[PDB]
């Protein structure tokens, strides 16, 4: 269970988008983590994503590993298409 998302947001993946994601994966008990700059941070880490400082024109690798790992990856996906944080 995992999917590569494209980062094309203007602000990037800072705290604002890190709070929208931590809320989605939060409902899922699966351990979904994002990948950026060779650093895998837990999707439930708003302060940990700030250290990455993602911006527009970048790539990220997500991977759900737990019980409903498949339900979590598609959950954050529809959230990225609702506002337009990545595809």
Curated annotation (Swiss-Prot):
Record PTM: Phosphorylated during sporulation.
InterPro entries linked to this entry: HPr, HPr-like, HPr-like_sf, PTS_HPr_His_P_site, PTS_HPr_Ser_P_site
Active site: 14 (pros-phosphohistidine intermediate)
Subcellular location: Cytoplasm
One Pfam family cited in the UniProt record for this chain: PTS-HPr
GO biological process: phosphoenolpyruvate-dependent sugar phosphotransferase system; regulation of carbohydrate utilization
Domain HPr residue range list: 1-87
Summary of activators and inhibitors of this protein: Phosphorylation on Ser-45 inhibits the phosphoryl transfer from enzyme I to HPr.
Domain of life: Bacteria
CDD domains attached to this UniProt entry: PTS-HPr_like
Sites bearing Phosphoserine, chain numbering: 11, 45
Gene Ontology CC: cytoplasm
Function summary: General (non sugar-specific) component of the phosphoenolpyruvate-dependent sugar phosphotransferase system (sugar PTS). This major carbohydrate active-transport system catalyzes the phosphorylation of incoming sugar substrates concomitantly with their translocation across the cell membrane. The phosphoryl group from phosphoenolpyruvate (PEP) is transferred to the phosphoryl carrier protein HPr by enzyme I. Phospho-HPr then transfers it to the PTS EIIA domain. P-Ser-HPr interacts with the catabolite control protein A (CcpA), forming a complex that binds to DNA at the catabolite response elements cre, operator sites preceding a large number of catabolite-regulated genes. Thus, P-Ser-HPr is a corepressor in carbon catabolite repression (CCR), a mechanism that allows bacteria to coordinate and optimize the utilization of available carbon sources. P-Ser-HPr also plays a role in inducer exclusion, in which it probably interacts with several non-PTS permeases and inhibits their transport activity.
Family assignment from sequence similarity: Belongs to the HPr family.
Name by which UniProt lists this protein: Phosphocarrier protein HPr
Underlying gene: ptsH
């Amino acid at each position: 269970a995992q999917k590569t998302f494209k980062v094309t947001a203007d602000s990037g993946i800072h705290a604002r988008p890190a709070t929208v994601l931590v809320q989605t994966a939060s409902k899922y008990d699966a351990d979904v983590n994002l990948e950026y700059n060779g650093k895998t941070v837990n999707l439930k880490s708003i302060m940990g994503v700030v250290s990455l400082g993602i911006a527009k024109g970048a790539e990220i690798t997500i991977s759900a590993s737990g019980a409903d790992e498949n339900d979590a990856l598609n959950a954050l996906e529809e959230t990225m298409k609702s506002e337009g944080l990545g595809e």
